[PDB]
Amino acid sequence: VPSVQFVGDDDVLSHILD
Amino acid sequence: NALHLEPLHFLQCHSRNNSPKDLETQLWACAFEPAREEGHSGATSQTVATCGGEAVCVIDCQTGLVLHKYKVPGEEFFSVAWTALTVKRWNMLAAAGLRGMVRLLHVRAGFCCSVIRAHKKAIATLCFSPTHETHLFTASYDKRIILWDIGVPNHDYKFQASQLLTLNCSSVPLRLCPVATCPDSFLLAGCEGGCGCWDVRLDQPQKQRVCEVNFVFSGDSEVSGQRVDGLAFVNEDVVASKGSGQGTIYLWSWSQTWASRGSQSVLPVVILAQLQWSPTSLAYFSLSTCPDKNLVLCGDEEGSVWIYDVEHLLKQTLQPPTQILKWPQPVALGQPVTKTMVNTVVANAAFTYLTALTDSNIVSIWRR
């Protein structure tokens, strides 16, 4: 069973911007 | 495990304060992206948008990577929905919640195109027309459902939205569901006070419309007037709907019900079957369907996913689920997450990926 994977803001591949 | 589903990822990606300790933010909605090319079904889509807290994420189900994230300080996102526009296809992601604003994201290009101040109260849910890809329904705590035309984006990716219809509700709308066989003519909505049908034809001249038919599911006074918090078509004719505190999901015939109507504004539905679901009195466990596989899906207060293959049932007492997918208690910070609730469960059309959202800042992704 996979563990819970934390994805922080620096782990996101791209941030959507205004 | 008759459906042969296996847990693939448990993603903690809507954390408050970017904290690995957040195992509490409620995740509210999810939606698989359409195909990236016109003419493709998108049935095996492996890209899912989720929202919760201040964030919308777009996730690859296969790898578990968060491809895109949109964060708005002070927002609480309650609903996401995609629409495929022709500009070449642009897959637009609409997101909304507490602030009453619809935020239209061009995900691939990486930015929020436009914002519609649709309501002065929170948007509970959003739903696009399956046939008119610029038509967007917003359902709000102001007890309105508004039908918008978001229009075509100008050269600079800006949208000019207009209002086509206002549907007035006697209680707060929770769940939207266009009628499968005539999705630009009639709209179903599950509301705090039950399930209704509204005439959304634009060739009728009234612009503010009350419910055309309020439906009745039970002659029990214990359930009369109670919420309908899950609502979806299993196939072109059969609706699956539920409330809380009844241990039951109703399967009913759109066509037989509508044929019986006449001019009655309150109408008992023609029930085809009843499914056993969890007995919890807790509200806001929504259901969904996978029509190609004849499935109803509904999470519960223990974090299970109830799965019903209703094919044989609808070809020929409360019917049991085909499978109950128990919460597998994945480890976070080294400890099992022993308890959670799954309020939303959504699969792609081919049923190769299933997403179950929790009240624990966990996106569950299962593969078949």
CSV table of C-alpha atoms in Angstrom, one decimal:
chain,number,residue,atom,x,y,z
A,1,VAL,CA,0.0,0.0,0.0
A,2,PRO,CA,1.5,3.3,-1.1
A,3,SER,CA,2.2,5.8,1.7
A,4,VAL,CA,0.8,9.3,1.7
A,5,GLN,CA,3.0,11.5,-0.5
A,6,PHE,CA,3.4,15.1,0.5
A,7,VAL,CA,3.5,17.5,-2.5
A,8,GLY,CA,4.6,20.9,-1.4
A,9,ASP,CA,4.6,24.1,-3.5
A,10,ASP,CA,8.2,23.5,-4.6
A,11,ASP,CA,7.2,19.9,-5.8
A,12,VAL,CA,4.5,21.1,-8.2
A,13,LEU,CA,5.7,21.1,-11.7
A,14,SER,CA,4.1,24.4,-12.6
A,15,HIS,CA,2.1,27.2,-10.9
A,16,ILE,CA,-0.8,28.8,-12.6
A,17,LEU,CA,-0.6,32.6,-12.3
A,18,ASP,CA,-3.0,35.5,-12.6
B,1,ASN,CA,-12.0,-7.2,-5.3
B,2,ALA,CA,-14.3,-8.1,-8.2
B,3,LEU,CA,-13.5,-4.9,-10.1
B,4,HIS,CA,-9.7,-5.5,-9.7
B,5,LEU,CA,-8.9,-2.0,-8.3
B,6,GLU,CA,-5.6,-1.3,-6.7
B,7,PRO,CA,-4.4,1.8,-4.7
B,8,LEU,CA,-1.8,3.7,-6.7
B,9,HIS,CA,-1.3,7.1,-5.0
B,10,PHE,CA,-2.4,9.0,-1.9
B,11,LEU,CA,-1.5,12.6,-2.6
B,12,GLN,CA,-1.3,15.3,0.1
B,13,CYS,CA,-1.2,18.4,-2.1
B,14,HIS,CA,-3.8,20.9,-0.8
B,15,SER,CA,-2.0,21.5,2.5
B,16,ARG,CA,-2.7,24.7,4.4
B,17,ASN,CA,0.5,26.7,5.0
B,18,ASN,CA,2.4,24.2,2.7
B,19,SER,CA,2.5,21.9,5.8
B,20,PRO,CA,3.2,18.2,5.7
B,21,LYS,CA,1.1,18.0,8.9
B,22,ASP,CA,-2.1,19.0,7.2
B,23,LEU,CA,-4.3,15.9,7.3
B,24,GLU,CA,-7.5,17.8,7.7
B,25,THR,CA,-8.2,20.1,4.8
B,26,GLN,CA,-11.4,19.0,3.1
B,27,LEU,CA,-11.2,18.2,-0.6
B,28,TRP,CA,-14.4,19.1,-2.3
B,29,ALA,CA,-14.4,18.2,-6.0
B,30,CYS,CA,-12.6,16.5,-8.8
B,31,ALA,CA,-13.0,16.2,-12.5
B,32,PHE,CA,-11.0,14.3,-15.2
B,33,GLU,CA,-9.7,16.4,-18.1
B,34,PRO,CA,-11.3,15.9,-21.5
B,35,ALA,CA,-9.2,14.6,-24.4
B,36,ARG,CA,-6.7,17.0,-25.7
B,37,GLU,CA,-7.8,16.6,-29.3
B,38,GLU,CA,-11.3,17.1,-30.8
B,39,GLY,CA,-13.0,13.9,-31.8
B,40,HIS,CA,-11.3,11.8,-29.0
B,41,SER,CA,-13.5,10.5,-26.3
B,42,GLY,CA,-11.1,11.2,-23.4
B,43,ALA,CA,-12.4,8.0,-21.8
B,44,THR,CA,-8.9,6.9,-20.6
B,45,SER,CA,-8.0,10.4,-19.4
B,46,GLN,CA,-5.4,10.2,-16.6
B,47,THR,CA,-5.4,13.9,-15.7
B,48,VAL,CA,-7.6,15.0,-12.9
B,49,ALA,CA,-8.3,18.4,-11.4
B,50,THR,CA,-9.0,18.5,-7.6
B,51,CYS,CA,-9.8,21.3,-5.3
B,52,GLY,CA,-9.7,22.0,-1.6
B,53,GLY,CA,-8.6,24.8,0.7
B,54,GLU,CA,-7.0,27.6,-1.3
B,55,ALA,CA,-5.9,25.4,-4.1
B,56,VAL,CA,-6.7,23.7,-7.4
B,57,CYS,CA,-4.4,20.9,-8.5
B,58,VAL,CA,-4.1,19.1,-11.8
B,59,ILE,CA,-2.7,15.7,-11.2
B,60,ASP,CA,-1.3,12.9,-13.5
B,61,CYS,CA,-3.0,9.8,-12.1
B,62,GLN,CA,-0.3,7.5,-13.5
B,63,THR,CA,2.8,9.1,-11.9
B,64,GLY,CA,1.0,11.0,-9.1
B,65,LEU,CA,2.8,14.2,-10.1
B,66,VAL,CA,1.1,17.6,-9.6
B,67,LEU,CA,1.4,19.0,-13.0
B,68,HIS,CA,-0.2,22.4,-12.2
B,69,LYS,CA,-1.3,24.2,-9.1
B,70,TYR,CA,-3.4,27.3,-8.7
B,71,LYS,CA,-3.6,28.9,-5.3
B,72,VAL,CA,-5.8,31.9,-4.2
B,73,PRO,CA,-5.2,33.3,-0.7
B,74,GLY,CA,-8.5,33.6,1.1
B,75,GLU,CA,-10.5,31.5,-1.3
B,76,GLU,CA,-12.0,28.1,-0.4
B,77,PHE,CA,-12.5,26.1,-3.6
B,78,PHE,CA,-15.6,23.9,-3.6
B,79,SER,CA,-16.0,23.0,-7.3
B,80,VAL,CA,-14.0,22.4,-10.5
B,81,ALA,CA,-15.3,21.5,-14.0
B,82,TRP,CA,-13.6,21.3,-17.4
B,83,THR,CA,-14.8,22.4,-20.8
B,84,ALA,CA,-13.2,21.7,-24.2
B,85,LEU,CA,-13.4,24.9,-26.3
B,86,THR,CA,-12.5,25.3,-30.0
B,87,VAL,CA,-10.3,28.3,-30.5
B,88,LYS,CA,-7.5,23.9,-32.0
B,89,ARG,CA,-8.8,22.7,-28.6
B,90,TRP,CA,-8.3,24.5,-25.3
B,91,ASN,CA,-9.2,22.6,-22.2
B,92,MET,CA,-10.4,25.3,-19.8
B,93,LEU,CA,-10.8,24.5,-16.1
B,94,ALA,CA,-13.4,26.5,-14.2
B,95,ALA,CA,-13.0,26.7,-10.4
B,96,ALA,CA,-15.1,28.4,-7.8
B,97,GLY,CA,-16.2,28.4,-4.1
B,98,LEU,CA,-16.5,30.6,-1.1
B,99,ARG,CA,-15.9,33.9,-2.9
B,100,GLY,CA,-18.7,33.5,-5.5
B,101,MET,CA,-16.2,33.9,-8.3
B,102,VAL,CA,-15.7,31.7,-11.3
B,103,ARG,CA,-11.9,31.5,-12.1
B,104,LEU,CA,-11.3,30.3,-15.6
B,105,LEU,CA,-7.9,28.7,-16.0
B,106,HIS,CA,-6.1,28.0,-19.2
B,107,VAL,CA,-4.2,25.2,-17.6
B,108,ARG,CA,-1.7,24.4,-20.4
B,109,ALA,CA,-0.8,28.0,-20.8
B,110,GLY,CA,-0.3,28.4,-17.1
B,111,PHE,CA,-2.7,31.3,-16.2
B,112,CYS,CA,-6.1,32.4,-15.0
B,113,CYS,CA,-7.7,33.9,-18.1
B,114,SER,CA,-10.7,35.6,-16.6
B,115,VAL,CA,-12.9,35.8,-13.5
B,116,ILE,CA,-16.7,36.0,-13.3
B,117,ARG,CA,-18.2,37.5,-10.2
B,118,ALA,CA,-21.2,35.2,-10.5
B,119,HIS,CA,-22.7,35.4,-7.1
B,120,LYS,CA,-22.4,37.4,-3.9
B,121,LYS,CA,-22.5,34.1,-1.9
B,122,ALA,CA,-20.5,31.0,-2.2
B,123,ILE,CA,-20.7,28.7,-5.2
B,124,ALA,CA,-21.6,25.2,-4.1
B,125,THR,CA,-21.0,23.6,-7.5
B,126,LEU,CA,-20.4,24.3,-11.2
B,127,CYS,CA,-21.4,22.3,-14.3
B,128,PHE,CA,-20.9,22.8,-18.0
B,129,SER,CA,-23.4,21.8,-20.6
B,130,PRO,CA,-22.1,18.6,-22.4
B,131,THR,CA,-23.3,20.0,-25.7
B,132,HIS,CA,-22.8,23.8,-25.6
B,133,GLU,CA,-19.3,23.9,-24.3
B,134,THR,CA,-19.5,27.7,-23.4
B,135,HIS,CA,-22.6,27.2,-21.3
B,136,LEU,CA,-21.8,27.1,-17.6
B,137,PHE,CA,-24.2,26.6,-14.7
B,138,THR,CA,-23.2,28.1,-11.3
B,139,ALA,CA,-25.2,27.0,-8.2
B,140,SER,CA,-25.0,29.2,-5.1
B,141,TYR,CA,-25.9,29.6,-1.5
B,142,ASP,CA,-27.9,32.6,-2.7
B,143,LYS,CA,-30.4,29.9,-3.8
B,144,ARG,CA,-29.9,30.6,-7.5
B,145,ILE,CA,-28.6,28.6,-10.3
B,146,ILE,CA,-27.3,30.9,-13.1
B,147,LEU,CA,-26.7,29.8,-16.6
B,148,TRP,CA,-23.8,31.7,-18.2
B,149,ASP,CA,-22.4,31.9,-21.7
B,150,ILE,CA,-18.7,32.3,-21.1
B,151,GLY,CA,-18.2,33.1,-24.8
B,152,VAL,CA,-15.1,32.8,-26.9
B,153,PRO,CA,-11.8,34.1,-25.6
B,154,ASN,CA,-10.6,37.2,-27.4
B,155,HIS,CA,-7.1,37.2,-29.0
B,156,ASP,CA,-5.6,38.0,-25.5
B,157,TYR,CA,-7.3,35.0,-23.8
B,158,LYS,CA,-10.0,37.2,-22.1
B,159,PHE,CA,-13.6,36.0,-21.7
B,160,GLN,CA,-16.7,38.2,-21.8
B,161,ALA,CA,-19.4,36.2,-19.9
B,162,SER,CA,-23.1,36.9,-20.1
B,163,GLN,CA,-26.1,35.6,-18.2
B,164,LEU,CA,-28.7,33.5,-20.1
B,165,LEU,CA,-31.0,32.3,-17.3
B,166,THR,CA,-31.6,32.6,-13.6
B,167,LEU,CA,-33.1,29.5,-11.9
B,168,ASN,CA,-34.7,30.2,-8.6
B,169,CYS,CA,-34.4,27.6,-5.9
B,170,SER,CA,-36.5,27.1,-2.7
B,171,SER,CA,-33.4,25.7,-1.0
B,172,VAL,CA,-29.6,25.8,-1.5
B,173,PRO,CA,-28.6,23.8,-4.6
B,174,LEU,CA,-25.9,21.2,-4.0
B,175,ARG,CA,-25.5,19.1,-7.1
B,176,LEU,CA,-26.2,19.8,-10.8
B,177,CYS,CA,-27.1,17.2,-13.4
B,178,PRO,CA,-28.3,18.0,-16.9
B,179,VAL,CA,-30.9,15.6,-18.2
B,180,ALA,CA,-28.9,13.1,-20.2
B,181,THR,CA,-31.2,12.9,-23.2
B,182,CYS,CA,-31.9,16.6,-23.4
B,183,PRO,CA,-29.2,18.4,-21.5
B,184,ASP,CA,-29.9,21.8,-23.0
B,185,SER,CA,-33.6,21.5,-22.3
B,186,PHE,CA,-33.9,20.3,-18.7
B,187,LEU,CA,-31.7,20.5,-15.7
B,188,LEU,CA,-31.9,18.4,-12.5
B,189,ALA,CA,-30.5,19.8,-9.2
B,190,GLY,CA,-30.1,18.1,-5.8
B,191,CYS,CA,-30.8,20.8,-3.1
B,192,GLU,CA,-31.0,21.0,0.6
B,193,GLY,CA,-34.7,20.4,0.3
B,194,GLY,CA,-34.8,17.8,-2.4
B,195,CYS,CA,-34.4,17.2,-6.1
B,196,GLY,CA,-35.9,19.4,-8.8
B,197,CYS,CA,-36.1,19.8,-12.5
B,198,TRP,CA,-35.8,23.2,-14.2
B,199,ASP,CA,-36.7,24.1,-17.8
B,200,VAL,CA,-33.5,25.6,-19.3
B,201,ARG,CA,-34.6,25.9,-22.9
B,202,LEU,CA,-33.5,29.3,-24.2
B,203,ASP,CA,-36.3,29.4,-26.8
B,204,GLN,CA,-38.8,29.9,-23.9
B,205,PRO,CA,-38.9,33.7,-23.1
B,206,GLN,CA,-38.9,33.9,-19.3
B,207,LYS,CA,-35.5,34.7,-17.8
B,208,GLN,CA,-36.1,33.9,-14.1
B,209,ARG,CA,-37.5,30.5,-13.7
B,210,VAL,CA,-38.8,28.5,-10.7
B,211,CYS,CA,-38.6,24.7,-10.5
B,212,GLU,CA,-40.9,23.0,-13.0
B,213,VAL,CA,-41.1,19.7,-11.1
B,214,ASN,CA,-40.1,18.9,-7.5
B,215,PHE,CA,-39.6,15.2,-7.1
B,216,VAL,CA,-40.7,12.8,-4.4
B,217,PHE,CA,-38.8,9.7,-3.6
B,218,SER,CA,-40.5,8.4,-0.5
B,219,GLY,CA,-43.9,8.5,1.2
B,220,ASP,CA,-42.2,8.4,4.6
B,221,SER,CA,-42.7,11.6,6.5
B,222,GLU,CA,-39.3,10.9,8.1
B,223,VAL,CA,-37.6,11.6,4.7
B,224,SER,CA,-40.0,14.0,3.0
B,225,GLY,CA,-38.4,17.3,2.2
B,226,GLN,CA,-34.9,16.1,2.9
B,227,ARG,CA,-31.7,16.9,0.9
B,228,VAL,CA,-30.6,15.2,-2.2
B,229,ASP,CA,-26.8,15.3,-2.1
B,230,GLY,CA,-25.9,12.9,-4.9
B,231,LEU,CA,-27.3,12.9,-8.4
B,232,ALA,CA,-26.0,11.4,-11.7
B,233,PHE,CA,-27.3,9.4,-14.7
B,234,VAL,CA,-26.2,5.8,-14.8
B,235,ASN,CA,-27.3,5.6,-18.5
B,236,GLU,CA,-29.4,7.8,-20.8
B,237,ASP,CA,-32.6,7.0,-18.9
B,238,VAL,CA,-31.7,5.9,-15.4
B,239,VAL,CA,-30.9,8.4,-12.6
B,240,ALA,CA,-29.1,7.5,-9.4
B,241,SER,CA,-29.8,9.9,-6.5
B,242,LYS,CA,-29.5,9.9,-2.8
B,243,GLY,CA,-29.9,11.9,0.4
B,244,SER,CA,-28.6,11.4,3.9
B,245,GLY,CA,-29.9,9.3,6.7
B,246,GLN,CA,-31.7,6.8,4.5
B,247,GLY,CA,-29.1,4.1,3.8
B,248,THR,CA,-30.3,4.1,0.3
B,249,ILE,CA,-29.5,5.1,-3.3
B,250,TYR,CA,-32.5,5.4,-5.6
B,251,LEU,CA,-32.4,4.3,-9.3
B,252,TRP,CA,-35.2,5.8,-11.2
B,253,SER,CA,-36.4,6.3,-14.8
B,254,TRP,CA,-36.2,9.8,-16.3
B,255,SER,CA,-38.5,8.9,-19.2
B,256,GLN,CA,-41.2,7.1,-17.2
B,257,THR,CA,-41.2,9.8,-14.5
B,258,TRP,CA,-41.4,12.7,-17.0
B,259,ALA,CA,-44.2,10.9,-19.0
B,260,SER,CA,-46.3,10.7,-15.8
B,261,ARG,CA,-46.0,14.4,-15.2
B,262,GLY,CA,-48.8,16.3,-16.8
B,263,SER,CA,-49.0,19.7,-15.1
B,264,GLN,CA,-48.1,18.5,-11.6
B,265,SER,CA,-45.4,20.6,-9.9
B,266,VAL,CA,-44.7,17.9,-7.3
B,267,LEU,CA,-44.1,14.4,-8.7
B,268,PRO,CA,-43.2,11.0,-7.3
B,269,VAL,CA,-40.5,9.4,-9.3
B,270,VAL,CA,-40.9,6.0,-11.0
B,271,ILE,CA,-38.4,4.0,-9.0
B,272,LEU,CA,-36.6,1.1,-10.7
B,273,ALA,CA,-34.5,-0.2,-7.9
B,274,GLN,CA,-33.1,0.8,-4.5
B,275,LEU,CA,-29.5,0.1,-3.5
B,276,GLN,CA,-28.1,-0.4,0.0
B,277,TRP,CA,-25.6,2.3,1.0
B,278,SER,CA,-24.2,3.3,4.3
B,279,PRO,CA,-26.7,4.1,7.1
B,280,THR,CA,-24.9,7.3,8.1
B,281,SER,CA,-26.9,10.4,8.9
B,282,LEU,CA,-24.0,12.5,7.8
B,283,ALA,CA,-24.7,14.8,4.8
B,284,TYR,CA,-22.8,15.6,1.6
B,285,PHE,CA,-21.6,12.2,0.4
B,286,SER,CA,-22.1,12.6,-3.4
B,287,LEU,CA,-22.3,9.7,-5.8
B,288,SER,CA,-21.1,9.4,-9.4
B,289,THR,CA,-21.5,6.9,-12.2
B,290,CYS,CA,-19.4,5.2,-14.9
B,291,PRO,CA,-22.0,4.6,-17.5
B,292,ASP,CA,-19.9,2.6,-19.9
B,293,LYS,CA,-19.4,0.0,-17.1
B,294,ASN,CA,-22.9,0.4,-15.6
B,295,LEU,CA,-21.5,1.5,-12.3
B,296,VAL,CA,-22.7,3.7,-9.4
B,297,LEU,CA,-19.9,4.9,-7.0
B,298,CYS,CA,-20.4,6.4,-3.6
B,299,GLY,CA,-17.9,7.0,-0.7
B,300,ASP,CA,-18.9,6.8,2.9
B,301,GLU,CA,-18.1,8.0,6.4
B,302,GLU,CA,-15.5,5.3,7.0
B,303,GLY,CA,-13.7,6.1,3.8
B,304,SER,CA,-15.0,3.1,1.8
B,305,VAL,CA,-16.1,3.3,-1.8
B,306,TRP,CA,-19.4,1.5,-2.4
B,307,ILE,CA,-19.5,0.2,-6.0
B,308,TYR,CA,-22.6,-1.2,-7.7
B,309,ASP,CA,-22.6,-2.9,-11.1
B,310,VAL,CA,-26.3,-2.3,-11.9
B,311,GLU,CA,-26.4,-4.0,-15.3
B,312,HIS,CA,-28.1,-7.2,-14.4
B,313,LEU,CA,-30.4,-5.4,-11.9
B,314,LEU,CA,-31.7,-3.0,-14.5
B,315,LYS,CA,-32.2,-5.8,-17.1
B,316,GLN,CA,-34.4,-7.8,-14.7
B,317,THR,CA,-35.7,-4.9,-1.5
B,318,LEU,CA,-32.4,-3.0,-1.0
B,319,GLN,CA,-29.8,-4.4,-3.4
B,320,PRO,CA,-26.2,-4.8,-2.1
B,321,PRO,CA,-23.1,-3.3,-3.6
B,322,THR,CA,-20.9,-5.4,-5.9
B,323,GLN,CA,-17.8,-4.4,-3.9
B,324,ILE,CA,-17.0,-2.2,-1.0
B,325,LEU,CA,-13.4,-0.8,-1.4
B,326,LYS,CA,-12.2,-0.2,2.2
B,327,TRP,CA,-10.0,2.7,3.1
B,328,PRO,CA,-6.5,1.1,3.0
B,329,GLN,CA,-5.1,3.2,5.8
B,330,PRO,CA,-2.0,4.6,4.0
B,331,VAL,CA,0.9,5.8,6.2
B,332,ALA,CA,1.5,9.5,6.7
B,333,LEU,CA,4.4,10.8,8.8
B,334,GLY,CA,5.0,7.1,9.6
B,335,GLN,CA,1.6,6.4,11.0
B,336,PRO,CA,-1.5,4.7,9.4
B,337,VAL,CA,-4.3,7.1,8.6
B,338,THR,CA,-6.7,4.8,10.3
B,339,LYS,CA,-9.9,6.9,9.7
B,340,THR,CA,-11.1,9.2,7.0
B,341,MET,CA,-14.3,10.0,5.0
B,342,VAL,CA,-14.6,9.9,1.2
B,343,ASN,CA,-17.3,12.5,0.2
B,344,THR,CA,-16.5,12.4,-3.6
B,345,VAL,CA,-15.5,9.6,-5.9
B,346,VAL,CA,-15.0,10.1,-9.6
B,347,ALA,CA,-13.7,7.7,-12.3
B,348,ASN,CA,-12.7,8.3,-15.9
B,349,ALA,CA,-15.2,7.0,-18.5
B,350,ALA,CA,-13.3,3.8,-19.2
B,351,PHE,CA,-12.9,3.1,-15.4
B,352,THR,CA,-9.1,2.7,-15.6
B,353,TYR,CA,-8.5,5.4,-12.9
B,354,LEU,CA,-10.7,6.2,-10.0
B,355,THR,CA,-10.2,9.2,-7.7
B,356,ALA,CA,-11.6,9.3,-4.1
B,357,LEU,CA,-11.3,12.6,-2.2
B,358,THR,CA,-11.1,12.6,1.5
B,359,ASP,CA,-11.7,15.0,4.4
B,360,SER,CA,-8.0,14.4,5.2
B,361,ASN,CA,-6.2,16.4,2.5
B,362,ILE,CA,-5.6,13.1,0.7
B,363,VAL,CA,-6.4,12.5,-3.0
B,364,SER,CA,-6.8,8.7,-3.4
B,365,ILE,CA,-6.0,7.4,-6.8
B,366,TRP,CA,-6.8,3.8,-7.8
B,367,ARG,CA,-6.0,2.0,-11.0
B,368,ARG,CA,-8.0,-0.9,-12.6
